[PDB]
From a paper:
Compared to typical mammals which express multigene families of classical MHC class I molecules, in chickens only the BF2 molecule is well-expressed and is the major ligand for cytotoxic T lymphocytes, while the BF1 molecule acts as a ligand for natural killer (NK) cells and is relatively poorly expressed if at all. The overall structure of BF2*1901 retains the common characteristics of MHC class I molecules from other vertebrates including chickens: the extracellular region of the BF2*1901 heavy chain folds into three different domains; the α1 and α2 domains form a typical MHC I peptide binding groove (PBG), which contains two α-helices and eight β-strands; the RY8 or IL9 peptide lies along the PBG, as shown by well-determined electron density maps. Compared to BF2*1501, BF2*1901 has a much narrower and shallower groove. In particular, the large residues Trp95, Arg111 and Tyr113 from the β-strands on the bottom of PBG of BF2*1901 are replaced by the much smaller Leu95, Ser111 and Asp113 in BF2*1501.
On the basis of the motifs determined above, peptides from MDV that might bind different chicken MHC molecules were predicted and the peptide RY8 (RRRENTDY) was selected because it was predicted to bind both BF2*1501 and BF2*1901, and shown to bind BF2*1501 (60). The structure of chicken class I molecule BF2*1901 complexed with MDV peptide RY8 was determined to resolution of 2.0 Å with two molecules in one asymmetric unit, while the structure of BF2*1901 with influenza virus peptide IL9 was determined at 2.0 Å with one molecule in an asymmetric unit. The Cα atom superposition of BF2*1901/RY8 onto the previously determined structure of BF2*1501 complexed to the same peptide RY8 generated an RMSD of 0.645 Å. Moreover, in the M1 of BF2*1901/RY8, the hydrogen bond between P1-Arg of peptide RY8 and the Glu65 of BF2*1901 is 3.58 Å, while no interaction between them is observed in B19/RY8 M2 (not shown). When we superposed the structures of B19/RY8 and B15/RY8 according to the Cα of α1/α2 domains, we found that the position of PΩ-Tyr of peptide RY8 in B19/RY8 structure is higher compared to RY8 in B15/RY8 structure. The solvent-accessible surface area of PΩ-Tyr that is buried upon interface formation with the pocket F in BF2*1901 (246.94 Å2 for molecule 1 and 219.72 Å2 for molecule 2 in the asymmetric unit cell) is smaller than PΩ-Tyr in BF2*1501 structure (260.38 Å2). Thus, the B19-specific residues Trp95 and Tyr113 act like two bricks to bolster up the PΩ-Tyr of peptide RY8 in B19. The P3-Arg protrudes the side chain out of the D pocket of B19/RY8 groove, while in the B15/RY8 structure, the P3-Arg anchors the side chain into the D pocket.
Author numbering:
A (entry chain B): 1 to 98
B (entry chain A): 1 to 217, 223 to 270
C (entry chain C): 1 to 8
Amino acid sequence: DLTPKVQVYSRFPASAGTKNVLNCFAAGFHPPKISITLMKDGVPMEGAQYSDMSFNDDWTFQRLVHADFTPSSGSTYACKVEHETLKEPQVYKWDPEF
Amino acid sequence: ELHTLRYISTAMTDPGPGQPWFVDVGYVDGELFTHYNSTARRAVPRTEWIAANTDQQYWDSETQTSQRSEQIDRDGLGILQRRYNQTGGSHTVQWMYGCDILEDGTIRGYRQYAYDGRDFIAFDKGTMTFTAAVPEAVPTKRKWEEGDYAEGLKQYLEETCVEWLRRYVEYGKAELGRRERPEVRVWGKEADGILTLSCRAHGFYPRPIAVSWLKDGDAQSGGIVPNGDGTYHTWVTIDAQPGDGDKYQCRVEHASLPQPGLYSW
Amino acid sequence: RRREQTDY
């Protein structure tokens, strides 16, 4: 299985109104072409940065996407991943854990 | 005491719209410190400590090596597609090489290749042999076994690579030797009559860490994943019976922590 | 420092 394994997480344990960075990490996938977009309420977040294409000892590819954000209560944050191995674009929700 | 220098390169027929088809990066002790791609066509620094301790001629030379490597992989993608009787589609060449200084003073060096994500050819410097994983790699092995290539590669892996790794860890000693303490959060969720306890370590450095769930003194780990800033993240969950939340403690072992931390839900 | 590869 060469599908992206995806994890969404913030740089710092989150709190409402506190500056943070939202991270989406996809790994274990092949081929390298992939779309990874950070979302806020179904809408692309601004200011995303993308790691340059890299790969693991087992040859599978990985990429980190991150963007500064200040988490709002009542907003939903997520990462949308599109890859050849997937039958749909896949949305991974961030759990704010507050 | 263990140090590593690792370079990787990717050559793609299908990198995606507006994406560079050739990308290489270098890592010292797992920290990304240089990068090149076929769009900018420059090898560039990626840490403060490499930029401060190198000069224009260093980056011109690294840029020359990457540009030459780019051209050989441009040729190689076509050579291999023809060897494989392929006429289009998504194909990738990858390679990685470098050296390790082990805690005992011994040295490891390696260089290996993959085509379409599976082993293609690999070099054993101690015996000066190549292992061809597939028949399409045998004509390559035949070339690489002749000429100056293999002796020069062995010398690079055992001498040049190690010498540079020693320079880099000296340049970066402050940043590479630092410790950053993880901020730990424990979080719980109940679904389908099962309590899922999550323990997350935010922003630790160096990379090695151990996070585990203890019950009264079957865990799933996302592994160690990177933050944007040179620190790391890990999450570890465990499935418990509802109401048993008080029985579990998250234990965090890290170099920055004189004693392991123990966290409740 | 990087090391170039040779023709396939």
